C-alpha cells in the first residue's frame, strides 16, 4: 500500500524521507537546482492545516524514485520546515491550474 498517494503516484515514507533530506540539504547550504529554483518557499496559499510551524519549503518528489536534479519537477512536492520537519506531501494533480491538493 501507499503511505501517500498523489493522483496515481504511489509513495512510501522512505521515498518521502529521501526526497526531504535532499531538499533540506540544499536549503541549508543556500543552493538551488532547476529552473524554478528548488527548494523554494511554499507560501501555503491553499491554507492547509499543517501541524508543524512555518516557514515551509517545497521540493519535488519523483515517481521514478530518483532524487530531483533538474528538469521537469512533475506534479508532486514534499513540504518541510526550517527544522526539517515534514509538513506534508502535495500535488498539482487533481487541482485546477497551479493550485495544490494534499496527497492522501
Ligand atoms: N499554489 C501554490 N503555489 C505556490 C505556493 N507557494 C509558492 N508557489 C509557487 O507560486 C507560483 C504560482 O502558483 C508557482 O511558481 C508555485 O511553484 P511550484 O510550481 O514550484 O509549486 C503556494 O502556497 N501555493
Ligand atoms: Ca480528485
From Swiss-Prot:
**What catalytic activity does the UniProt entry give for this protein?**
[RNA] containing guanosine + H2O = an [RNA fragment]-3'-guanosine-3'-phosphate + a 5'-hydroxy-ribonucleotide-3'-[RNA fragment]
Sorted alphabetically, the keyword list is:
Disulfide bond, Endonuclease, Hydrolase, Lyase, Nuclease, Signal
EC numbers on record: 4.6.1.24
- Stated name of the protein: Guanyl-specific ribonuclease T1
Disulfide bridge partners, by residue number: 2-10, 6-103
Keyword Hydrolase in record: yes
Tell me its family. Answer: Belongs to the ribonuclease N1/T1 family.
Q: Active site: which residues?
A: 40, 58 (proton acceptor), 92 (proton donor)
Citing just one GO molecular function, the answer is: RNA binding
Q: Name one GO cellular component term.
A: hyphal tip
- Origin organism is Aspergillus oryzae (strain ATCC 42149 / RIB 40) (Yellow koji mold)
What does the subunit section of this Swiss-Prot or TrEMBL entry state?
Monomer.
Amino acid at each position: 500500500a501507499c503511505d501517500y498517494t498523489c493522483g496515481s503516484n504511489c509513495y512510501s515514507s522512505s521515498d518521502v524521507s529521501t526526497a526531504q533530506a535532499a531538499g533540506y540539504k540544499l536549503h541549508e547550504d543556500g543552493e538551488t537546482v532547476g529552473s524554478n529554483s528548488y527548494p523554494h518557499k511554499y507560501n501555503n496559499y491553499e491554507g492547509f492545516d499543517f501541524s508543524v510551524s512555518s516557514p515551509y519549503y517545497e521540493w519535488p518528489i519523483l515517481s521514478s524514485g530518483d532524487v530531483y536534479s533538474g528538469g521537469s519537477p512533475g506534479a508532486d512536492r514534499v513540504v518541510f520546515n526550517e527544522n526539517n520537519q515534514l509538513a506534508g506531501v502535495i500535488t498539482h494533480t487533481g487541482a485546477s491550474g497551479n493550485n495544490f491538493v494534499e496527497c492522501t
